[PDB]
Amino acid sequence: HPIFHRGEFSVCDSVSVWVGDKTTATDIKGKEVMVLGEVNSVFKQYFFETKCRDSGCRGIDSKHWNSYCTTTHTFVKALTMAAWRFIRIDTACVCVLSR
Amino acid sequence: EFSVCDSVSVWVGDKTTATDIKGKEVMVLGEVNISVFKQYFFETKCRDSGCRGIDSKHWNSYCTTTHTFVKALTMDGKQAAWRFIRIDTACVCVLSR
DNA sequence: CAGAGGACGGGGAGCCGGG
DNA sequence: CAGAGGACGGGGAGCCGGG
């Protein structure tokens, strides 16, 4: 999904990228932290990030609704400065409504 | 304000099995070392009709759970291996017609 | 190191989790 | 075990990434 060959598409478009160069982050606490290049046997730290691409979300009933596309976040462990902590990684592009 | 597709988020700390980024089933180890830590994962997914707020007249629609990839310490034979596994991460709306 | 309401959700840092 | 195209997206295991 979306099942393209069947004509499907997201309400909000996203872009996904692998992030190998991360140096600072906001942690789960809401505080800014330094993220290490490598963690221990030894690995580079990589994060899969997915952001809103781009108004309004596609396919919305504008007679009843305001809408916008926004980036939501998950929490992924990372070695940070040394502590093993949850950090905010962008993860989807979802559609939020009102009025 | 609310989502077009309602999600539920939860902490999971009892994951023994998962699908890895290759598409293959793998065993997830209880704990990982540095001082030891349990592996917990943040998982978000759809709860449940179309999505909410959609122009029904013109569009079919459904809510679906999307996934991200998170490293975890996994069993590979008699060795430990640090592999990306698939984790539910959001609920989004897919359109058609 | 010390939870949860209203119906036609709730345990572990101002943390994660609204016709 | 060695990339990318139509236009009013592209590098590192069937892997990640459509009026």
PDB file of all heavy atoms in Angstrom, chain C residues 7-19:
ATOM      1  P    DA C   7     -21.023  10.180  30.632  1.00  0.00           P
ATOM      2  OP1  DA C   7     -21.120  10.787  29.279  1.00  0.00           O
ATOM      3  OP2  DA C   7     -22.224  10.069  31.487  1.00  0.00           O
ATOM      4  O5'  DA C   7     -20.416   8.719  30.435  1.00  0.00           O
ATOM      5  C5'  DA C   7     -21.096   7.727  29.625  1.00  0.00           C
ATOM      6  C4'  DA C   7     -20.749   7.865  28.158  1.00  0.00           C
ATOM      7  O4'  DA C   7     -19.318   7.914  27.964  1.00  0.00           O
ATOM      8  C3'  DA C   7     -21.235   6.697  27.296  1.00  0.00           C
ATOM      9  O3'  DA C   7     -22.434   7.041  26.595  1.00  0.00           O
ATOM     10  C2'  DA C   7     -20.105   6.443  26.310  1.00  0.00           C
ATOM     11  C1'  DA C   7     -19.037   7.468  26.654  1.00  0.00           C
ATOM     12  N9   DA C   7     -17.672   6.940  26.634  1.00  0.00           N
ATOM     13  C8   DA C   7     -17.250   5.642  26.805  1.00  0.00           C
ATOM     14  N7   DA C   7     -15.952   5.489  26.699  1.00  0.00           N
ATOM     15  C5   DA C   7     -15.487   6.771  26.440  1.00  0.00           C
ATOM     16  C6   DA C   7     -14.197   7.283  26.219  1.00  0.00           C
ATOM     17  N6   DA C   7     -13.090   6.534  26.224  1.00  0.00           N
ATOM     18  N1   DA C   7     -14.081   8.607  25.976  1.00  0.00           N
ATOM     19  C2   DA C   7     -15.190   9.359  25.968  1.00  0.00           C
ATOM     20  N3   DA C   7     -16.456   8.994  26.150  1.00  0.00           N
ATOM     21  C4   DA C   7     -16.538   7.671  26.379  1.00  0.00           C
ATOM     22  P    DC C   8     -23.509   5.915  26.255  1.00  0.00           P
ATOM     23  OP1  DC C   8     -24.791   6.602  26.438  1.00  0.00           O
ATOM     24  OP2  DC C   8     -23.201   4.732  27.088  1.00  0.00           O
ATOM     25  O5'  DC C   8     -23.247   5.723  24.760  1.00  0.00           O
ATOM     26  C5'  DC C   8     -24.150   4.928  23.865  1.00  0.00           C
ATOM     27  C4'  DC C   8     -24.002   5.431  22.445  1.00  0.00           C
ATOM     28  O4'  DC C   8     -24.181   6.860  22.385  1.00  0.00           O
ATOM     29  C3'  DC C   8     -22.644   5.171  21.810  1.00  0.00           C
ATOM     30  O3'  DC C   8     -22.807   3.955  21.090  1.00  0.00           O
ATOM     31  C2'  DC C   8     -22.471   6.321  20.831  1.00  0.00           C
ATOM     32  C1'  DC C   8     -23.382   7.422  21.356  1.00  0.00           C
ATOM     33  N1   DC C   8     -22.694   8.587  21.923  1.00  0.00           N
ATOM     34  C2   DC C   8     -22.400   9.668  21.086  1.00  0.00           C
ATOM     35  O2   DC C   8     -22.693   9.591  19.885  1.00  0.00           O
ATOM     36  N3   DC C   8     -21.804  10.766  21.605  1.00  0.00           N
ATOM     37  C4   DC C   8     -21.501  10.807  22.907  1.00  0.00           C
ATOM     38  N4   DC C   8     -20.894  11.903  23.375  1.00  0.00           N
ATOM     39  C5   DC C   8     -21.795   9.720  23.785  1.00  0.00           C
ATOM     40  C6   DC C   8     -22.392   8.643  23.256  1.00  0.00           C
ATOM     41  P    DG C   9     -11.002   1.506  24.954  1.00  0.00           P
ATOM     42  OP1  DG C   9     -10.696   0.043  24.929  1.00  0.00           O
ATOM     43  OP2  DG C   9     -11.869   2.093  26.016  1.00  0.00           O
ATOM     44  O5'  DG C   9      -9.593   2.247  24.943  1.00  0.00           O
ATOM     45  C5'  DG C   9      -9.447   3.571  25.464  1.00  0.00           C
ATOM     46  C4'  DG C   9      -8.126   3.666  26.180  1.00  0.00           C
ATOM     47  O4'  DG C   9      -7.659   5.019  26.088  1.00  0.00           O
ATOM     48  C3'  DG C   9      -8.217   3.313  27.659  1.00  0.00           C
ATOM     49  O3'  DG C   9      -7.409   2.162  27.828  1.00  0.00           O
ATOM     50  C2'  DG C   9      -7.651   4.513  28.399  1.00  0.00           C
ATOM     51  C1'  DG C   9      -7.242   5.524  27.333  1.00  0.00           C
ATOM     52  N9   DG C   9      -7.862   6.829  27.495  1.00  0.00           N
ATOM     53  C8   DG C   9      -9.096   7.083  28.039  1.00  0.00           C
ATOM     54  N7   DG C   9      -9.382   8.357  28.085  1.00  0.00           N
ATOM     55  C5   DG C   9      -8.287   8.977  27.503  1.00  0.00           C
ATOM     56  C6   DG C   9      -8.041  10.347  27.244  1.00  0.00           C
ATOM     57  O6   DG C   9      -8.770  11.317  27.480  1.00  0.00           O
ATOM     58  N1   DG C   9      -6.805  10.539  26.631  1.00  0.00           N
ATOM     59  C2   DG C   9      -5.908   9.544  26.336  1.00  0.00           C
ATOM     60  N2   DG C   9      -4.762   9.933  25.757  1.00  0.00           N
ATOM     61  N3   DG C   9      -6.129   8.258  26.568  1.00  0.00           N
ATOM     62  C4   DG C   9      -7.337   8.048  27.134  1.00  0.00           C
ATOM     63  P    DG C  10      -7.582   1.289  29.116  1.00  0.00           P
ATOM     64  OP1  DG C  10      -7.593  -0.156  28.737  1.00  0.00           O
ATOM     65  OP2  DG C  10      -8.708   1.867  29.887  1.00  0.00           O
ATOM     66  O5'  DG C  10      -6.219   1.541  29.897  1.00  0.00           O
ATOM     67  C5'  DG C  10      -4.938   1.244  29.333  1.00  0.00           C
ATOM     68  C4'  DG C  10      -3.896   1.984  30.135  1.00  0.00           C
ATOM     69  O4'  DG C  10      -3.898   3.381  29.760  1.00  0.00           O
ATOM     70  C3'  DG C  10      -4.159   1.949  31.639  1.00  0.00           C
ATOM     71  O3'  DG C  10      -2.970   1.525  32.284  1.00  0.00           O
ATOM     72  C2'  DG C  10      -4.538   3.378  31.985  1.00  0.00           C
ATOM     73  C1'  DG C  10      -3.829   4.174  30.917  1.00  0.00           C
ATOM     74  N9   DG C  10      -4.417   5.481  30.620  1.00  0.00           N
ATOM     75  C8   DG C  10      -5.642   5.941  31.039  1.00  0.00           C
ATOM     76  N7   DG C  10      -5.891   7.162  30.651  1.00  0.00           N
ATOM     77  C5   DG C  10      -4.763   7.535  29.932  1.00  0.00           C
ATOM     78  C6   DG C  10      -4.446   8.761  29.285  1.00  0.00           C
ATOM     79  O6   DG C  10      -5.126   9.794  29.209  1.00  0.00           O
ATOM     80  N1   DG C  10      -3.189   8.716  28.690  1.00  0.00           N
ATOM     81  C2   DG C  10      -2.341   7.637  28.722  1.00  0.00           C
ATOM     82  N2   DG C  10      -1.181   7.775  28.060  1.00  0.00           N
ATOM     83  N3   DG C  10      -2.626   6.489  29.319  1.00  0.00           N
ATOM     84  C4   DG C  10      -3.843   6.509  29.902  1.00  0.00           C
ATOM     85  P    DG C  11      -3.057   0.760  33.683  1.00  0.00           P
ATOM     86  OP1  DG C  11      -3.910  -0.459  33.514  1.00  0.00           O
ATOM     87  OP2  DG C  11      -3.389   1.754  34.741  1.00  0.00           O
ATOM     88  O5'  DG C  11      -1.560   0.292  33.926  1.00  0.00           O
ATOM     89  C5'  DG C  11      -0.956  -0.695  33.093  1.00  0.00           C
ATOM     90  C4'  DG C  11       0.500  -0.342  32.947  1.00  0.00           C
ATOM     91  O4'  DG C  11       0.588   0.878  32.172  1.00  0.00           O
ATOM     92  C3'  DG C  11       1.225  -0.071  34.275  1.00  0.00           C
ATOM     93  O3'  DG C  11       2.458  -0.807  34.206  1.00  0.00           O
ATOM     94  C2'  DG C  11       1.353   1.447  34.313  1.00  0.00           C
ATOM     95  C1'  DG C  11       1.430   1.797  32.828  1.00  0.00           C
ATOM     96  N9   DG C  11       1.024   3.151  32.456  1.00  0.00           N
ATOM     97  C8   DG C  11       0.007   3.897  33.000  1.00  0.00           C
ATOM     98  N7   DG C  11      -0.075   5.097  32.493  1.00  0.00           N
ATOM     99  C5   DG C  11       0.960   5.152  31.570  1.00  0.00           C
ATOM    100  C6   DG C  11       1.383   6.213  30.725  1.00  0.00           C
ATOM    101  O6   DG C  11       0.925   7.360  30.630  1.00  0.00           O
ATOM    102  N1   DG C  11       2.479   5.842  29.958  1.00  0.00           N
ATOM    103  C2   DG C  11       3.099   4.616  30.005  1.00  0.00           C
ATOM    104  N2   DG C  11       4.144   4.450  29.179  1.00  0.00           N
ATOM    105  N3   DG C  11       2.720   3.626  30.795  1.00  0.00           N
ATOM    106  C4   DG C  11       1.656   3.964  31.548  1.00  0.00           C
ATOM    107  P    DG C  12       3.564  -0.726  35.373  1.00  0.00           P
ATOM    108  OP1  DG C  12       4.025  -2.115  35.644  1.00  0.00           O
ATOM    109  OP2  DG C  12       3.030   0.132  36.450  1.00  0.00           O
ATOM    110  O5'  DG C  12       4.789  -0.009  34.664  1.00  0.00           O
ATOM    111  C5'  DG C  12       5.349  -0.520  33.444  1.00  0.00           C
ATOM    112  C4'  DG C  12       6.278   0.529  32.886  1.00  0.00           C
ATOM    113  O4'  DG C  12       5.508   1.704  32.560  1.00  0.00           O
ATOM    114  C3'  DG C  12       7.325   0.983  33.910  1.00  0.00           C
ATOM    115  O3'  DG C  12       8.607   0.651  33.389  1.00  0.00           O
ATOM    116  C2'  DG C  12       7.092   2.480  34.073  1.00  0.00           C
ATOM    117  C1'  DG C  12       6.313   2.831  32.831  1.00  0.00           C
ATOM    118  N9   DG C  12       5.449   4.000  32.964  1.00  0.00           N
ATOM    119  C8   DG C  12       4.316   4.121  33.727  1.00  0.00           C
ATOM    120  N7   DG C  12       3.780   5.309  33.662  1.00  0.00           N
ATOM    121  C5   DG C  12       4.599   6.008  32.788  1.00  0.00           C
ATOM    122  C6   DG C  12       4.526   7.351  32.340  1.00  0.00           C
ATOM    123  O6   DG C  12       3.675   8.210  32.617  1.00  0.00           O
ATOM    124  N1   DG C  12       5.572   7.658  31.471  1.00  0.00           N
ATOM    125  C2   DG C  12       6.567   6.785  31.090  1.00  0.00           C
ATOM    126  N2   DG C  12       7.497   7.263  30.240  1.00  0.00           N
ATOM    127  N3   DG C  12       6.644   5.532  31.508  1.00  0.00           N
ATOM    128  C4   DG C  12       5.633   5.214  32.347  1.00  0.00           C
ATOM    129  P    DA C  13      15.035  16.399  35.001  1.00  0.00           P
ATOM    130  OP1  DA C  13      16.452  16.100  34.877  1.00  0.00           O
ATOM    131  OP2  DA C  13      14.603  17.697  35.546  1.00  0.00           O
ATOM    132  O5'  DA C  13      14.401  16.437  33.546  1.00  0.00           O
ATOM    133  C5'  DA C  13      13.026  16.749  33.336  1.00  0.00           C
ATOM    134  C4'  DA C  13      12.678  16.488  31.890  1.00  0.00           C
ATOM    135  O4'  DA C  13      12.543  15.054  31.678  1.00  0.00           O
ATOM    136  C3'  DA C  13      11.362  17.135  31.455  1.00  0.00           C
ATOM    137  O3'  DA C  13      11.699  18.155  30.516  1.00  0.00           O
ATOM    138  C2'  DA C  13      10.654  16.054  30.649  1.00  0.00           C
ATOM    139  C1'  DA C  13      11.310  14.733  31.078  1.00  0.00           C
ATOM    140  N9   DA C  13      10.508  13.959  32.022  1.00  0.00           N
ATOM    141  C8   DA C  13      10.175  12.635  31.865  1.00  0.00           C
ATOM    142  N7   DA C  13       9.356  12.182  32.783  1.00  0.00           N
ATOM    143  C5   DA C  13       9.088  13.293  33.567  1.00  0.00           C
ATOM    144  C6   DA C  13       8.271  13.478  34.704  1.00  0.00           C
ATOM    145  N6   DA C  13       7.553  12.502  35.273  1.00  0.00           N
ATOM    146  N1   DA C  13       8.210  14.719  35.235  1.00  0.00           N
ATOM    147  C2   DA C  13       8.949  15.693  34.679  1.00  0.00           C
ATOM    148  N3   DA C  13       9.748  15.645  33.613  1.00  0.00           N
ATOM    149  C4   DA C  13       9.775  14.402  33.096  1.00  0.00           C
ATOM    150  P    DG C  14      11.602  19.721  30.891  1.00  0.00           P
ATOM    151  OP1  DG C  14      11.708  20.467  29.624  1.00  0.00           O
ATOM    152  OP2  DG C  14      12.501  20.003  32.038  1.00  0.00           O
ATOM    153  O5'  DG C  14      10.126  19.861  31.468  1.00  0.00           O
ATOM    154  C5'  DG C  14       8.977  19.729  30.600  1.00  0.00           C
ATOM    155  C4'  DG C  14       7.775  19.451  31.467  1.00  0.00           C
ATOM    156  O4'  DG C  14       7.477  20.632  32.255  1.00  0.00           O
ATOM    157  C3'  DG C  14       6.475  19.091  30.758  1.00  0.00           C
ATOM    158  O3'  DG C  14       6.426  17.678  30.689  1.00  0.00           O
ATOM    159  C2'  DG C  14       5.441  19.541  31.774  1.00  0.00           C
ATOM    160  C1'  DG C  14       6.072  20.838  32.296  1.00  0.00           C
ATOM    161  N9   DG C  14       5.789  22.029  31.496  1.00  0.00           N
ATOM    162  C8   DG C  14       5.044  22.100  30.342  1.00  0.00           C
ATOM    163  N7   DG C  14       4.989  23.307  29.842  1.00  0.00           N
ATOM    164  C5   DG C  14       5.745  24.077  30.718  1.00  0.00           C
ATOM    165  C6   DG C  14       6.032  25.468  30.708  1.00  0.00           C
ATOM    166  O6   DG C  14       5.688  26.321  29.884  1.00  0.00           O
ATOM    167  N1   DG C  14       6.816  25.836  31.795  1.00  0.00           N
ATOM    168  C2   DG C  14       7.284  24.980  32.755  1.00  0.00           C
ATOM    169  N2   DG C  14       8.037  25.533  33.719  1.00  0.00           N
ATOM    170  N3   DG C  14       7.025  23.683  32.778  1.00  0.00           N
ATOM    171  C4   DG C  14       6.249  23.305  31.741  1.00  0.00           C
ATOM    172  P    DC C  15       5.565  16.883  29.564  1.00  0.00           P
ATOM    173  OP1  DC C  15       5.259  17.769  28.423  1.00  0.00           O
ATOM    174  OP2  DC C  15       4.479  16.181  30.246  1.00  0.00           O
ATOM    175  O5'  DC C  15       6.595  15.753  29.113  1.00  0.00           O
ATOM    176  C5'  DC C  15       7.719  16.007  28.284  1.00  0.00           C
ATOM    177  C4'  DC C  15       8.303  14.673  27.878  1.00  0.00           C
ATOM    178  O4'  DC C  15       8.852  13.970  29.023  1.00  0.00           O
ATOM    179  C3'  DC C  15       7.305  13.692  27.259  1.00  0.00           C
ATOM    180  O3'  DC C  15       7.372  13.963  25.869  1.00  0.00           O
ATOM    181  C2'  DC C  15       7.975  12.368  27.529  1.00  0.00           C
ATOM    182  C1'  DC C  15       8.550  12.580  28.928  1.00  0.00           C
ATOM    183  N1   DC C  15       7.561  12.239  29.970  1.00  0.00           N
ATOM    184  C2   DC C  15       7.239  10.885  30.141  1.00  0.00           C
ATOM    185  O2   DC C  15       7.864  10.037  29.490  1.00  0.00           O
ATOM    186  N3   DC C  15       6.280  10.539  31.037  1.00  0.00           N
ATOM    187  C4   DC C  15       5.631  11.491  31.721  1.00  0.00           C
ATOM    188  N4   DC C  15       4.680  11.108  32.582  1.00  0.00           N
ATOM    189  C5   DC C  15       5.925  12.879  31.550  1.00  0.00           C
ATOM    190  C6   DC C  15       6.872  13.205  30.657  1.00  0.00           C
ATOM    191  P    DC C  16       6.153  13.758  24.932  1.00  0.00           P
ATOM    192  OP1  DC C  16       6.514  14.404  23.668  1.00  0.00           O
ATOM    193  OP2  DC C  16       4.867  14.160  25.564  1.00  0.00           O
ATOM    194  O5'  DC C  16       6.153  12.168  24.873  1.00  0.00           O
ATOM    195  C5'  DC C  16       7.089  11.467  24.055  1.00  0.00           C
ATOM    196  C4'  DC C  16       6.900   9.987  24.274  1.00  0.00           C
ATOM    197  O4'  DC C  16       7.170   9.629  25.649  1.00  0.00           O
ATOM    198  C3'  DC C  16       5.492   9.471  24.042  1.00  0.00           C
ATOM    199  O3'  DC C  16       5.203   9.383  22.648  1.00  0.00           O
ATOM    200  C2'  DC C  16       5.609   8.122  24.702  1.00  0.00           C
ATOM    201  C1'  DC C  16       6.321   8.537  25.990  1.00  0.00           C
ATOM    202  N1   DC C  16       5.352   8.986  27.016  1.00  0.00           N
ATOM    203  C2   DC C  16       4.699   7.995  27.752  1.00  0.00           C
ATOM    204  O2   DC C  16       5.013   6.803  27.561  1.00  0.00           O
ATOM    205  N3   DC C  16       3.775   8.356  28.675  1.00  0.00           N
ATOM    206  C4   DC C  16       3.474   9.643  28.850  1.00  0.00           C
ATOM    207  N4   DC C  16       2.554   9.950  29.773  1.00  0.00           N
ATOM    208  C5   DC C  16       4.104  10.672  28.095  1.00  0.00           C
ATOM    209  C6   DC C  16       5.022  10.302  27.188  1.00  0.00           C
ATOM    210  P    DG C  17       3.881  10.023  22.027  1.00  0.00           P
ATOM    211  OP1  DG C  17       3.871   9.625  20.608  1.00  0.00           O
ATOM    212  OP2  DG C  17       3.856  11.481  22.365  1.00  0.00           O
ATOM    213  O5'  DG C  17       2.698   9.349  22.851  1.00  0.00           O
ATOM    214  C5'  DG C  17       1.343   9.807  22.684  1.00  0.00           C
ATOM    215  C4'  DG C  17       0.484   9.363  23.850  1.00  0.00           C
ATOM    216  O4'  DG C  17       0.526   7.919  23.962  1.00  0.00           O
ATOM    217  C3'  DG C  17       0.920   9.881  25.213  1.00  0.00           C
ATOM    218  O3'  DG C  17      -0.238  10.025  26.063  1.00  0.00           O
ATOM    219  C2'  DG C  17       1.723   8.707  25.740  1.00  0.00           C
ATOM    220  C1'  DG C  17       0.858   7.566  25.270  1.00  0.00           C
ATOM    221  N9   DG C  17       1.481   6.247  25.238  1.00  0.00           N
ATOM    222  C8   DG C  17       2.471   5.788  24.395  1.00  0.00           C
ATOM    223  N7   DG C  17       2.858   4.569  24.674  1.00  0.00           N
ATOM    224  C5   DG C  17       2.070   4.200  25.760  1.00  0.00           C
ATOM    225  C6   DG C  17       2.010   2.977  26.492  1.00  0.00           C
ATOM    226  O6   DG C  17       2.652   1.929  26.314  1.00  0.00           O
ATOM    227  N1   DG C  17       1.101   3.058  27.540  1.00  0.00           N
ATOM    228  C2   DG C  17       0.316   4.146  27.822  1.00  0.00           C
ATOM    229  N2   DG C  17      -0.537   4.012  28.848  1.00  0.00           N
ATOM    230  N3   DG C  17       0.355   5.280  27.149  1.00  0.00           N
ATOM    231  C4   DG C  17       1.233   5.234  26.132  1.00  0.00           C
ATOM    232  P    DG C  18     -10.226  17.738  24.883  1.00  0.00           P
ATOM    233  OP1  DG C  18      -9.082  18.548  25.378  1.00  0.00           O
ATOM    234  OP2  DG C  18     -11.591  17.954  25.449  1.00  0.00           O
ATOM    235  O5'  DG C  18     -10.318  18.025  23.325  1.00  0.00           O
ATOM    236  C5'  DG C  18     -11.361  17.442  22.564  1.00  0.00           C
ATOM    237  C4'  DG C  18     -11.168  17.809  21.115  1.00  0.00           C
ATOM    238  O4'  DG C  18     -10.007  17.131  20.587  1.00  0.00           O
ATOM    239  C3'  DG C  18     -12.340  17.417  20.225  1.00  0.00           C
ATOM    240  O3'  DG C  18     -13.121  18.613  20.078  1.00  0.00           O
ATOM    241  C2'  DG C  18     -11.676  16.970  18.936  1.00  0.00           C
ATOM    242  C1'  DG C  18     -10.312  16.467  19.379  1.00  0.00           C
ATOM    243  N9   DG C  18     -10.216  15.029  19.622  1.00  0.00           N
ATOM    244  C8   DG C  18      -9.233  14.186  19.163  1.00  0.00           C
ATOM    245  N7   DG C  18      -9.407  12.946  19.531  1.00  0.00           N
ATOM    246  C5   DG C  18     -10.577  12.969  20.278  1.00  0.00           C
ATOM    247  C6   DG C  18     -11.262  11.918  20.952  1.00  0.00           C
ATOM    248  O6   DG C  18     -10.972  10.714  21.000  1.00  0.00           O
ATOM    249  N1   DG C  18     -12.412  12.381  21.585  1.00  0.00           N
ATOM    250  C2   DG C  18     -12.832  13.691  21.603  1.00  0.00           C
ATOM    251  N2   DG C  18     -13.965  13.942  22.279  1.00  0.00           N
ATOM    252  N3   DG C  18     -12.193  14.682  20.996  1.00  0.00           N
ATOM    253  C4   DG C  18     -11.090  14.248  20.344  1.00  0.00           C
ATOM    254  P    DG C  19     -19.082  20.042  15.404  1.00  0.00           P
ATOM    255  OP1  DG C  19     -19.184  21.363  14.699  1.00  0.00           O
ATOM    256  OP2  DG C  19     -19.432  19.915  16.853  1.00  0.00           O
ATOM    257  O5'  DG C  19     -19.730  18.833  14.581  1.00  0.00           O
ATOM    258  C5'  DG C  19     -20.809  18.996  13.656  1.00  0.00           C
ATOM    259  C4'  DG C  19     -21.653  17.743  13.704  1.00  0.00           C
ATOM    260  O4'  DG C  19     -21.033  16.869  14.675  1.00  0.00           O
ATOM    261  C3'  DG C  19     -23.102  17.965  14.166  1.00  0.00           C
ATOM    262  O3'  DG C  19     -24.074  18.009  13.092  1.00  0.00           O
ATOM    263  C2'  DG C  19     -23.337  16.902  15.236  1.00  0.00           C
ATOM    264  C1'  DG C  19     -22.019  16.130  15.374  1.00  0.00           C
ATOM    265  N9   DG C  19     -21.534  15.915  16.740  1.00  0.00           N
ATOM    266  C8   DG C  19     -20.815  16.795  17.516  1.00  0.00           C
ATOM    267  N7   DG C  19     -20.487  16.302  18.681  1.00  0.00           N
ATOM    268  C5   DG C  19     -21.028  15.023  18.680  1.00  0.00           C
ATOM    269  C6   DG C  19     -20.996  14.002  19.677  1.00  0.00           C
ATOM    270  O6   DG C  19     -20.488  14.039  20.805  1.00  0.00           O
ATOM    271  N1   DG C  19     -21.666  12.857  19.259  1.00  0.00           N
ATOM    272  C2   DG C  19     -22.274  12.701  18.036  1.00  0.00           C
ATOM    273  N2   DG C  19     -22.855  11.513  17.819  1.00  0.00           N
ATOM    274  N3   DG C  19     -22.299  13.634  17.093  1.00  0.00           N
ATOM    275  C4   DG C  19     -21.674  14.766  17.486  1.00  0.00           C
TER     276       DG C  19
END
